[PDB]
Design a protein around this nucleic acid. Structure first.
Ligand SMILES: [Zn+2]
Ligand SMILES: [Zn+2]
Lengths: 656, 82, 163, 325
DNA sequence: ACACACTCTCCAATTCTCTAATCACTTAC
DNA sequence: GTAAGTGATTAGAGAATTGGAGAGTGTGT
C-alpha cells in the first residue's frame, strides 16, 4: 500500500525560500492521493502516512498561494486539504477510543493535526480563498450561479471551520497566561485579510440559509479562548504607570522571599534528646506519649499525622475540571476582537439567531448546540458589561418569554440524559447542560439590566412582564433544588457546580425583591391548579437540607483561590440560614469548623490593619460570629452532636 | 483486610471514650472563639489517634461523618442520648 | 548595638550562683541548651522590643581533663580539653530540610530532616498519583560543617605514653 | 470535549518564574543601545547557525531596564534560569522562518550573564549562598575533555508503543514515572529514543585559589567547575580567570537505584536516610560551581585595529633611537 | 539473600427491587 | 369539621456488579 503514497507525495514540487515550484502533473498526483484516502481501511494507513509526510504545511498551502494556479488545480487542492483537515473523532466515525490500542491510533491522528496549525498564520492564504467567495456571492447574480462553484464555496467554508477547531500544541514550549496565544496569530491573519466582512455579508442575506449554521460555528470558534470581561473594558495605557506598577510587583516578590527564608532558617534547632508528655496516654498499656524532637510546648504535638498516607477515592468518583486555554492577550488583539464583536452585533446577530434556532436541535450533529449556547452567553454578557445601551435593539431575538421557555426545555432534557446514562456519553450530555445553564444565567441578568436602566417605559414594561413570569411559574422556581439533588462529581464538572451556585444567588435576589415590593403574594400550584399564599422564609427553608449544604461546604474549601463573587455567594447563602431563619444548629458541623481553622491560620500571617484590608475578611468575620455563638453554651454532648449531619427532629430535640 | 466500621465506632474505643475525654474540657465563653476551636480540634485528633492509628485525622472524621448514616449507629445514638 | 549574635557564658559565674543548675547543665547538655537559648531571646526581646536576623546563641565555656582519661560514662556530657591545631578540612554542607516535587503535575512540598532522617511523601494531594515525587537538591536548605584535628599536649603525660 | 479523551494533568504555576519570564521576554524584544540598535533582537538571528547556542548579556543593561528584575535574578538565579531559557526559545522562534523552525525545535539555548562587580573570595563560599548569582576568580589546573550530556529525553512504552516526551533529567539518568497513555498500566518497561532526544555539550574543570587570597600559614583551596555549551574548551591550563555563575550542590548519585540503573556500589560523616531509592544506603553531597560565563582576567590588520592611541605611542617608541637603554 | 514485580483473591461499596410500616388524604357522618 | 380507613411513600434489607488493596511467590542480581 504505502509505497503508492510515498510515490505520490514526493512528486508534487519543492519549496524554495519565498517561492513554491510545481511539477506539471500535480493534478493527477492529487487525484491518486484522494483515491487512496477513499480506499483506506480501519487502520488508516494512507492517512497516517500523509500525516507523517506533512502535506498540508509543506506543499498544499504554499501551492494554493501561487498566482499561476488554474481553476482545477485550486479545486482539487482544496478537496485534498479539506479531507486531510477533517477532525480525528469524525475520522473514527464518532466512537471514542475505548481501548489501549485504539487510543494510540487516536493520538497518532491528533498530533498530525496539531502540528499543521502554524501553516495558517499568513494572510496570503485567506486572501487567495476570499476571491473565490467574492466571485460566487458578490460578482454573480442569483439567476446565473454554477453548482460547481457552489460546491467549491461550501468546501472553503467547511475548511475554515475545520481550521479554527484545531486544539493547542504543548510540544512547541510553555507560554505564559499574559501574552498572545498561537490561536491569536491565526486570528490576526484571518482579520487582516478582511474575509470576515464577506462572511458577515453572506450571513445577513435571508436567501442563503444553508451557510448560516456554519458561519455561527465559525464565529463561536473564533471567540473560543476569550471572555467578555477581556473585551468589555476599553484598552488604554501609559508606560510611566506601567513601569511604576511592575516595579511594585517585583518589590512584593522580593519582600515575600526574604521574610519566608528568614522564618524558615530561624525555625531550626541545634541538638536533640527525647521527651515524655506526662498526661497523654499511648496505645500500649501504662504508657505515656514520647516525642523525639525538642518541642516548644505540648500543643505543638501532632501525633505524627505527617507520616500517614492519605486515603483516595476510586478513579470513577474524583472531581475533574474542564480546561479552556484562557489568557489576557495583547492590546492589539483585544482591540481587533472588540471591533469584530460590535460589527457582528450591528450586522448579523438577529438574522443569524433567527435562522439557526429552527434547525440546531433538529440536526444529527451535536456540536452546534454548544456553539449556539456559547455565542448567546458571550454576546449578552458583552452588551451588559460594556453598557452599549443603544445596541439593545439589535439583540431583540433573545429578549422574549419564549427564550426562557425554550432554554428551560433544552436544559431539562440535558440534565436527565446526563444523570441516567453512564460513562463518556453521560459526560458528553453534561457538557451540553453546562452551557445551557450559563446562557440561562445571562438571560436573567440581562432582563434585570433592561428593567433597571432602559430609557423607554414600553421596554421596561416588556422586561417586567417576563420577570414576573419567571418569579410566578413553578418550573423556574423549583429548578435549583432539582439540579442540586441530582449533582454527581462522576459525570459533572466543578465548573458546573460553581455556575449553579452563582445562578442560585442571582435568582434568589430577584425573588426577594419581588416579595419585598409586594408583587408576589399568592402562587399557583398543581394538583387542576389552585392558588396558595407564598412565604419567602418557607422558600429559603428548602435550601437548609443536608443534600444542599454538602456542596456549599465542599466548595468553601477552595476559598484561597475562588473568585470574590463566588466567595460572597457561598457566605451569603450560609448567612441567610444563620441569621434570617436564625437556625445555627444546622450549621454546627465539624467539616465546616475545618474550613474555619484553615481561614484562621491564613489570617495569622497578617497585621491587624492588613486583616481588615484583606479580601477574605467577610469569611473571617462570619466564622468569628458563628464560633462565638457555638461556644456561648458549650457542652460535651453538643460536641458529640457536631460529628453528624442533623435532620429536622434532631434539631428540635437538640434545641428543646 | 482491616477498616474502620460500626463495631469500632460503637465499641469501647468509640463515642463513649470520646465523651470521657471531653468531660474535662471547659472553655471560657468570653475568650477568642478561634482559640477555643483550636483547643477542641486537637482533642478530636487525640481521640481519633487512639481510636484508629492507621489513618489521618481528616480522613477519620470524614469516615465518622459517613458512618453516622448507618442504622446501627442511629440506634446507638438513640440509646446514648438518654 | 553591634548586632553580635552570641553570648559567651562563663560557667564559673553560674556555679557561684547555683550549683543545682550547674550540675544539670553539665549532665544534660543535649536537652537543656535548647531552652536556656529561649530564655536569653525572651529577655532580649523584652528589654529592647526588637528582632534580629538570627537567634542569639549560647556558648558555655571554662567548665579540664586529659584525652586518655575519658570513659563510657562521659558520653553526651560536657567536657573541655586543650591542644594544638594541625589541620582543618574544607566545608561540608549538612541538610536541615528537603524539597520534593511531583513528577506528574509540578506540585511541591517541603519536608524537615530530623533525628538524622527525612520522611518522603507517598501520595500527591493535588493530582492523586502514588510513588510520584522526586527530590530537588538545590531547592533545599543546608548548613556549614568543618572537621578540625587536635593533638595532645606532651607535658602532663605519665611514663611511656605517645601523644 | 477531547481534553477529557486526552489524559493530561494541569500544571501548577511558579508565579515568580512566570513574571521573570514575561519581563525577560520584554527585555529581549525592546532594549535599545545609545546607537538606537536592538542588540539582542539582532543576536537572536545568529542562533539558527549550527555552531551557536548562547546569548551574552551585560548585567548593567538589565539594571538599566529594570532594577528589581536584576535584583530578583541575582537573588533567585537557580530557580528562575529555566524560565529565562524558555523566553529566549520562544523569542527566537518568533524570528525564525518556516525553513528554520524545523531545526530549532530540538535545540538547546543558553543565557550567559557577565560584568558583575560583586566579587567574593573562594573561602567565603558558605552553604548559605546556594542558588545565587556570584562572581569569583581563580587559576585553572585541569581541563577535562568534551562529552555530550542528556538534557531532555523521549521514551517509548514497550507495551503499547506510545512516545512520552520531554522527561527532564536530573544529575542521574531517569525514566518516566507513568505511561502517557491513560489506558496503560506500565511504569517500568521503557526504551529510550535517540533521534528525538536532545544532547548538551559538557566540560568539567578544576580551579585553585590565587595567591593574593591566602590567609596566615595557609595552603590554597580548590574548586570543581561545570561548563556547558558554547563555553566548552575556551580556556587552557595555567590561565587565570574570572567566572560568573552560581554555587550548586551535587549528590553521590551512585547510592541510588531506579528503573534503568542499579547502584554502582552494589554492582562493585553521616548521610541522609529515608528515600525509597535508598533502601539501606545514605546520601552525601559536594560543592561545585556552575559557570555562567568565564574569561581570562587580562598582523597589519591588528596594527590598523589598534588605531589611535596605541599606534601613536608605539610608533613614537619605534622612532626612539635610545629605546634599548 | 534480598529486593522488586506480578498476579490472584477477597471484601466493601453502590444500586436496584421488594416488603413492611407510618403518615396523609379522602370519604362519610 | 372531625374521625376512621385505605392508599402511597419512605425506609430497610437482600442480592449482584465493579474495583482496588494486600499478600504471597517467583525471578534476577
Ligand atoms: Zn502531582
Ligand atoms: Zn504504555
Amino acid at each position: 500500500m504505502n509505497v503508492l503514497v510515498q510515490g505520490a507525495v514526493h512528486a508534487l514540487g519543492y519549496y524554495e525560500d519565498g517561492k513554491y515550484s510545481r511539477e506539471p502533473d500535480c493534478y493527477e498526483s492529487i487525484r491518486d492521493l484522494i483515491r487512496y484516502l477513499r480506499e483506506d481501511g480501519d487502520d488508516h494507513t494512507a492517512r497516517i502516512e500523509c500525516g507523517r509526510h506533512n502535506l498540508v504545511e509543506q506543499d498544499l498551502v504554499p501551492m494554493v498561494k501561487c498566482e499561476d494556479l488554474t481553476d482545477d488545480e485550486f479545486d482539487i487542492a482544496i478537496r485534498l486539504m479539506v479531507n486531510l483537515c477533517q477532525p480525528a473523532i469524525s475520522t473514527m466515525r464518532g466512537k471514542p477510543p475505548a481501548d489501549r490500542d485504539q487510543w494510540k491510533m487516536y493520538w497518532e491522528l491528533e498530533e498530525n493535526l496539531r502540528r499543521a496549525k502554524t501553516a495558517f498564520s499568513d494572510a496570503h492564504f485567506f486572501t487567495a480563498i476570499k476571491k473565490r467567495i467574492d466571485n460566487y456571492f458578490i460578482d454573480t447574480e442569483y439567476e446565473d450561479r454554477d453548482e460547481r462553484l457552489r460546491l467549491v464555496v461550501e468546501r472553503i467554508v467547511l475548511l475554515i471551520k475545520y481550521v479554527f477547531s484545531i486544539n493547542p500544541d504543548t510540544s512547541e514550549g510553555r507560554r505564559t497566561r499574559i501574552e498572545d496565544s498561537s490561536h491569536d496569530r491565526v486570528i490576526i491573519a484571518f482579520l487582516e485579510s478582511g474575509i470576515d466582512k464577506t462572511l458577515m455579508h453572506i450571513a445577513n442575506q435571508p436567501r442563503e440559509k444553508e451557510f448560516h449554521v456554519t458561519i455561527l460555528d465559525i464565529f463561536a470558534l473564533i471567540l473560543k479562548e476569550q471572555t467578555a470581561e477581556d473585551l468589555a473594558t476599553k484598552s488604554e495605557e501609559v508606560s510611566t504607570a506601567e513601569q511604576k506598577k511592575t516595579e511594585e510587583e517585583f518589590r512584593k516578590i522580593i519582600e515575600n522571599h526574604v521574610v519566608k527564608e528568614t522564618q524558615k532558617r530561624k525555625s531550626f534547632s541545634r541538638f536533640g534528646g527525647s521527651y515524655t508528655i506526662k498526661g497523654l496516654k499511648g496505645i500500649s498499656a501504662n504508657s505515656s506519649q514520647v516525642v523525639f524532637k525538642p518541642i516548644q510546648n505540648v500543643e505543638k504535638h501532632n501525633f505524627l499525622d505527617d507520616r500517614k498516607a492519605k486515603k483516595r477515592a476510586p478513579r470513577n468518583r474524583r472531581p475533574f475540571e474542564i480546561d479552556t486555554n484562557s489568557h489576557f492577550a495583547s492590546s492589539e488583539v483585544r482591540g481587533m476582537l472588540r471591533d469584530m464583536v460590535i460589527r457582528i452585533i450591528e450586522t448579523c446577530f438577529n438574522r443569524l439567531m433567527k435562522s439557526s434556532k429552527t434547525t440546531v436541535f433538529v440536526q444529527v450533529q451535536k456540536t452546534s448546540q454548544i456553539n449556539y449556547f456559547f455565542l448567546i452567553k458571550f454576546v449578552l454578557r458583552f452588551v451588559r458589561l460594556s453598557r452599549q445601551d443603544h445596541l439593545l435593539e439589535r439583540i431583540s431575538e433573545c429578549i422574549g418569554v419564549e427564550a426562557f421557555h425554550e432554554n428551560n426545555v433544552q436544559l431539562t432534557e440535558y440534565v436527565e440524559n446526563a444523570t441516567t446514562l453512564k460513562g463518556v456519553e453521560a459526560k458528553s450530555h453534561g457538557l451540553k447542560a453546562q452551557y445551557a445553564l450559563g446562557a440561562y444565567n445571562e438571560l436573567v441578568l440581562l432582563h434585570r439590566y433592561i428593567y433597571e436602566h432602559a430609557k423607554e417605559e414600553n421596554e421596561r414594561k416588556f422586561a417586567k412582564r417576563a420577570l414576573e413570569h419567571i418569579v410566578n411559574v413553578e418550573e423556574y422556581r423549583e429548578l435549583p433544588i432539582f439540579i442540586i439533588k441530582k449533582f454527581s462529581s462522576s459525570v459533572l464538572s466543578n465548573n458546573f457546580l460553581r455556575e449553579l451556585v452563582l445562578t442560585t444567588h442571582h435568582y434568589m435576589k430577584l425573588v426577594e425583591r419581588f416579595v419585598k415590593t409586594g408583587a408576589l403574594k399568592k402562587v399557583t400550584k398543581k394538583v387542576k391548579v389552585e392558588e396558595i399564599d407564598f412565604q419567602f422564609d418557607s422558600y429559603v427553608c428548602k435550601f437548609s437540607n443536608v443534600d444542599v449544604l454538602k456542596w456549599y461546604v465542599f466548595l468553601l474549601n477552595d476559598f484561597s483561590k475562588n473568585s470574590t463573587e463566588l466567595n460572597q455567594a457561598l457566605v451569603k447563602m450560609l448567612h441567610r440560614i444563620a441569621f434570617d431563619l436564625k437556625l445555627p444548629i444546622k450549621l454546627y458541623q465539624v467539616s465546616l469548623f475545618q474550613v474555619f481553622s484553615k481561614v484562621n491560620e491564613h489570617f495569622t500571617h497578617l497585621s491587624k490593619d492588613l486583616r481588615k484590608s484583606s479580601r477574605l475578611y467577610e469569611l473571617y468575620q462570619f466564622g468569628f460570629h458563628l464560633l462565638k455563638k457555638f461556644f456561648s453554651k458549650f457542652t460535651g454532648d453538643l460536641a458529640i452532636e457536631a460529628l453528624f449531619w442533623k435532620g429536622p427532629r434532631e434539631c428540635f430535640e437538640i434545641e428543646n | 483486610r482491616l477498616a474502620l466500621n460500626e463495631r469500632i465506632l460503637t465499641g469501647p474505643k468509640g463515642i463513649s471514650a470520646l465523651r470521657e475525654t471531653l468531660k474535662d474540657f471547659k472553655p471560657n465563653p468570653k475568650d477568642d472563639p478561634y482559640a477555643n476551636l483550636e483547643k477542641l480540634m486537637k482533642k478530636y485528633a487525640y481521640w481519633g489517634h487512639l481510636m484508629f492509628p492507621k489513618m489521618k485525622t481528616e480522613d477519620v472524621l470524614n469516615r465518622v461523618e459517613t458512618l453516622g448514616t448507618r442504622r446501627q449507629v442511629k440506634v446507638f445514638m438513640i440509646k446514648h442520648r438518654l | 548595638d553591634a548586632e553580635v549574635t552570641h553570648i559567651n557564658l562563663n560557667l564559673k559565674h553560674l556555679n557561684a550562683f547555683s550549683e543545682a543548675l550547674y550540675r544539670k547543665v553539665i549532665a544534660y547538655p543535649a536537652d537543656v541548651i535548647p531552652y536556656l537559648d529561649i530564655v536569653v531571646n525572651e529577655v532580649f526581646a523584652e528589654r529592647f522590643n526588637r528582632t534580629l536576623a538570627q537567634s542569639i546563641e549560647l556558648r558555655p565555656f571554662n567548665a579540664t581533663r586529659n584525652m586518655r582519661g575519658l570513659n563510657p560514662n562521659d558520653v553526651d556530657q560536657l567536657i573541655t580539653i586543650s591542644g594544638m591545631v594541625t589541620r582543618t578540612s574544607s566545608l561540608i554542607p549538612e541538610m536541615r530540610s528537603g524539597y520534593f516535587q511531583c513528577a506528574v503535575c509540578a506540585f511541591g512540598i517541603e519536608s524537615e530532616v530530623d533525628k538524622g532522617r527525612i520522611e518522603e511523601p507517598v501520595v500527591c494531594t493535588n493530582c492523586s498519583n502514588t510513588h510520584c515525587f522526586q527530590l530537588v537538591h538545590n531547592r533545599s536548605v543546608f548548613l556549614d560543617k568543618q572537621v578540625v584535628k587536635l593533638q595532645e599536649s606532651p607535658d602532663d603525660m605519665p611514663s611511656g605514653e605517645t601523644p | 470535549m477531547d481534553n477529557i479523551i486526552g489524559g493530561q494533568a494541569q500544571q501548577v504555576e511558579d508565579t515568580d518564574g512566570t513574571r521573570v519570564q514575561n519581563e525577560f521576554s520584554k527585555f529581549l524584544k525592546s532594549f535599545k543601545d545609545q546607537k538606537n540598535e536592538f542588540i539582542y533582537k539582532s543576536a537572536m538571528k545568529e542562533l539558527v547557525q549550527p555552531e551557536k547556542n548562547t546569548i551574552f548579556i551585560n548585567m548593567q543593561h538589565l539594571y538599566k531596564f529594570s532594577n528589581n528584575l536584576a535584583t530578583t535574578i541575582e537573588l533567585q538565579y537557580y530557580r528562575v534560569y529555566p524560565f529565562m531559557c524558555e523566553a529566549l526559545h520562544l523569542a527566537t522562534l518568533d524570528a525564525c522562518d518556516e525553513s528554520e523552525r524545523q531545526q530549532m525545535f530540538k535545540k538547546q539555548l543558553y543565557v550567559s550573564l557577565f560584568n558583575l562587580d560583586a566579587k567574593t573570595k573562594v573561602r567565603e563560599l558558605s552553604a548559605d549562598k546556594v542558588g545565587g548569582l556570584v562572581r569569583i576568580a581563580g587559576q585553572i589546573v585541569r581541563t577535562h575533555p568534551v562529552h555530550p550530556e542528556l538534557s531532555r529525553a523521549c521514551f517509548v512504552c514497550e507495551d503499547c508503543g506510545v512516545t512520552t516526551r520531554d522527561v527532564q533529567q536530573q544529575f542521574r539518568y531517569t525514566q518516566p514515572t507513568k505511561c502517557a497513555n491513560p489506558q496503560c498500566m506500565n511504569r517500568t518497561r521503557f526504551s529510550l529514543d535517540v533521534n528525538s532526544s536532545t544532547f548538551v555539550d559538557f566540560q568539567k574543570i578544576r580551579i585553585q585559589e590565587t595567591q593574593a587570597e591566602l590567609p596566615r600559614g595557609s595552603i590554597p583551596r580548590t574548586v570543581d567547575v561545570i561548563v556547558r555549551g558554547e563555553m566548552v574548551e575556551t580556556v587552557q591550563p595555567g590561565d587565570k580567570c574570572d567566572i560568573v555563575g552560581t554555587l550548586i550542590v551535587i549528590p553521590d548519585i551512585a547510592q541510588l537505584s531506579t528503573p534503568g540503573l542499579r547502584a554502582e556500589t552494589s554492582n562493585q560523616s553521616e548521610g541522609i536516610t529515608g528515600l525509597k531509592a535508598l533502601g539501606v544506603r545514605d546520601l552525601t553531597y559536594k560543592m561545585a560551581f556552575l559557570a555562567c560565563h568565564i574569561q581570562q582576567t587580562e598582523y597589519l590588520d591588528l596594527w590598523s585595529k589598534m588605531s589611535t592611541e596605541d599606534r601613536a605611542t608605539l610608533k613614537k617608541m619605534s622612532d626612539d633611537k635610545k629605546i634599548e637603554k
